[PDB]
Amino acid sequence: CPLMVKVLDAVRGSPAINVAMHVFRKAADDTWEPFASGKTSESGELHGLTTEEEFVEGIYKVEIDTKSYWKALGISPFHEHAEVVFTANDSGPRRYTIAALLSPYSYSTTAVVTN
Amino acid sequence: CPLMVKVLDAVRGSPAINVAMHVFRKAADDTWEPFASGKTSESGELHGLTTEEEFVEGIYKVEIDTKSYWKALGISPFHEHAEVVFTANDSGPRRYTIAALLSPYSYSTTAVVTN
Numbered sequence: 001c002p003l004m005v006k007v008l009d010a011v012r013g014s015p016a017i018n019v020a021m022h023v024f025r026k027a028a029d030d031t032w033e034p035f036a037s038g039k040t041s042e043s044g045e046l047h048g049l050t051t052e053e054e055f056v057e058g059i060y061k062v063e064i065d066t067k068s069y070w071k072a073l074g075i076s077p078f079h080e081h082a083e084v085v086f087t088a089n090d091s092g093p094r095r096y097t098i099a100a101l102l103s104p105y106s107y108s109t110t111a112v113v114t115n
Numbered sequence: 116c117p118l119m120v121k122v123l124d125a126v127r128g129s130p131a132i133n134v135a136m137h138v139f140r141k142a143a144d145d146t147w148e149p150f151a152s153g154k155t156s157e158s159g160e161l162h163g164l165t166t167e168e169e170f171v172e173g174i175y176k177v178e179i180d181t182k183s184y185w186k187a188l189g190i191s192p193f194h195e196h197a198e199v200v201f202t203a204n205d206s207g208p209r210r211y212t213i214a215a216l217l218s219p220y221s222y223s224t225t226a227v228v229t230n
């Protein structure tokens with residue numbers, strides 16, 4: 001599993017469940033092409049987005065639909081989405097965990113990169 | 116000053132100085148058109164991006180060039196940039212401060228919306 005996303009809710013102290021996200025990859029003409037998508041499970045995790053063979057070097061964008069998450073909880077949040085843009089696999093294959101901790105007016109994001 | 120951006124450095128415990136950023140407004144065709152830009156001051160702040168008359172309701176993106184900041188310090192970063200995408204909404208008088216706290220592999224962003 002070369003790309004995993006984990007989302008937590010800082011208001012409830014819980015995984016953020018059923019959060020949709022779309023992953024894009026920058027094409028040679030500098031446009032964002034669709035790459036993968038999914039939603040978080042009961043654990044707040046989204047696994048299985050890609051494979052080692054498909055997840056080539058490139059610039060990737062993870063767009064996490066945080067606004068829909070908060071709206072369903074009755075909250076009108078600040079951000080439209082949380083965006084995570086990064087170069088992947090520039091020194092060979094790595095495994096990436098993208099993590100996001102969500103509040104209505106704030107989010108924090110980090111990455112855990114392992115070889 | 117309806118929109119200000121403040122950037123801090125979590126490795127050095129200091130304002131993040133000379134950080135470049137661009138602000139975009141989402142257009143009718145779903146493209147991002149340039150709106151304003153600048154670099155943070157010695158206090159880590161960027162003032163004077165827009166005026167109350169120009170800062171109408173809509174979806175705005177602040178793209179902060181965090182990669183160049185870390186590169187200038189000789190530190191290898193994860194993100195290409197930090198992206199803050201939000202809707203501006205007229206609910207009485209509002210001033211927006213977008214704040215970002217930067218680490219090489221993580222950032223946190225919040226909004227302080229005041230009257």
Ligand SMILES: CCc1oc2cc(O)ccc2c1C(=O)c1cc(Br)c(O)c(Br)c1
Pocket residue numbers: 006007008097099100101108109110112
């Ligand atoms: C979305 C996950 C996450 O994002 C953060 C942002 C922060 O600033 C501080 C903490 C977190 C955080 C975690 O608590 C967390 C991460 C992993 Br990885 C994990 O396995 C488990 Br359990 C918990």
Ligand SMILES: CCc1oc2cc(O)ccc2c1C(=O)c1cc(Br)c(O)c(Br)c1
Pocket residue numbers: 108121123212214215216223224225227
């Ligand atoms: C309480 C201030 C604060 O706490 C954080 C926690 C985070 O994880 C990330 C960022 C912040 C953060 C700021 O960016 C901030 C700092 C100053 Br100083 C300031 O004047 C303004 Br406005 C905003």
